[PDB]
Design a protein around this ligand. Structure first.
Ligand code: 6FX
Ligand code: 6FX
Ligand code: 6FX
Ligand code: 6FX
Lengths: 118, 117, 120, 120
């Protein structure tokens, strides 16, 4: 299922546990200790039984004991099981800004995760 | 300044606690238990003190003990303090779909939250 | 109707003509970013919208190059026109810069602009 | 510029575009089979003087989903960059806005990504 270690297309490492209560918990590394960050999120713990994927999302605030970028990324997507399981996401990365700079505060993109290094 | 009850522009209520460890926890509703959902997220617990906002994000999966939309929303944004404090966000709402329908799986929008409804 | 001069919430000026064939043409002047004076825009709109109270779907693009500056970037606005006593165009936008492959992951900004014929 | 010609996305769609000397994109967006009912006008803009440091070329375009045969009351904008070479690509993110009532406007806009190649 969702619980496990995943890698995006750029080599980031997503170590996640999907709990019985719909919770996602774990760590995100965008490969050393000072690049590891806490993540939390939620997933559909009772997905449809018609072949559909499992909706999920999570957040990382880019502060740890070593760095603080004053920013946070959310990933929104779905887990697709099968022979090569995949989590397909789109993401929003918002930085803290002044009001005058808020129009350019948010980047957008897409990440795909597999259980194998790219 | 984040902990408390917040209201978006469409009548939803966002009840959140910002913990010392950077955690966001709480509930999201659009007023009975049937419409209330768990949320979890993260925020910058050491923001700049130069007028910049506080970056944050959270997720709701749209399942509770009564309903399940097989979907989840993530909000990404910043808290802005002051006399009219706000949480300004953009959001992504992904539904569980088949592969053939995955191209249309994700809605995008924006929500602004205030401390008074 | 869509044809007219519009302003967003940040002071940008959007001067547009909606042609009978579905074409949007005109100029955009931005109050933010690496921008000066007017830039060409082109786009499309639904020339036969639904009659059930729905807005009119539309979109347009500005490449941020003119005779004065070139930011090596382009914005697309996607949205709908909503008529009424306070006519409005509500949009969400994507702004992509030309980048190297190593920097492409952070090539695209996203936001939302609302346009009115009265300048806020 | 390398942009003019026929491009194919990952899901069976095709577009033929001309990149004008002035920065104009004009052409037609269609399905793989190419029947008349699947063809729509496309219009956009690109950076006609891109950087020379290995960066991509920023561009965008719009298709309103109305033709002489059908009308979905919606429009898509693609925002992205062209990357040249033997394996040329246009890498995009897109926004698809439908005309809606105010009460349904919150769910009016879909978001995704498309990659285009010169080979089907
Ligand atoms: C030291 O700073 C960081 O590691 C850092 C800062 N700011 C953003 C990101 C990051 C990583 C990442 C990703 O894997 N997918 C989508 C977005 C995204 O953003 C990482
Ligand atoms: C019964 O189903 C629901 O309550 C439900 C289902 N699917 C989505 C949403 C919802 C609410 C909401 C919001 O306040 N801001 C952004 C997105 C968003 O999505 C609610
Ligand atoms: C990275 O951004 C640029 O290079 C840039 C240059 N010049 C103008 C703009 C600009 C202006 C503008 C607006 O009014 N609404 C939405 C997006 C947007 O982007 C962006
Ligand atoms: C015949 O086609 C339609 O009626 C139609 C209606 N509504 C949307 C689309 C469409 C096609 C398409 C795409 O190739 N990439 C991204 C978005 C996208 O949207 C097509």
């Amino acid at each position: 299922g969702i619980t496990g270690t995943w890698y995006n297309q750029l080599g980031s490492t997503f170590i996640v546990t999907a709990g019985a209560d719909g919770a996602l918990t774990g760590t995100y590394e965008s490969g050393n200790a000072e690049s590891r960050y806490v993540l939390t999120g939620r997933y559909d713990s009772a997905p449809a039984t018609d072949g559909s994927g499992t909706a999920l999302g999570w957040t990382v605030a880019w502060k740890n004991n070593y760095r603080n970028a004053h920013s946070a990324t959310t990933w929104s997507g779905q887990y697709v099981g099968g022979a090569e399981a995949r989590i397909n996401t789109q993401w929003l990365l918002t930085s803290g800004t002044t009001e005058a700079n808020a129009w350019k505060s948010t980047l957008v993109g897409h990440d795909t995760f597999t259980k194998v290094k790219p």
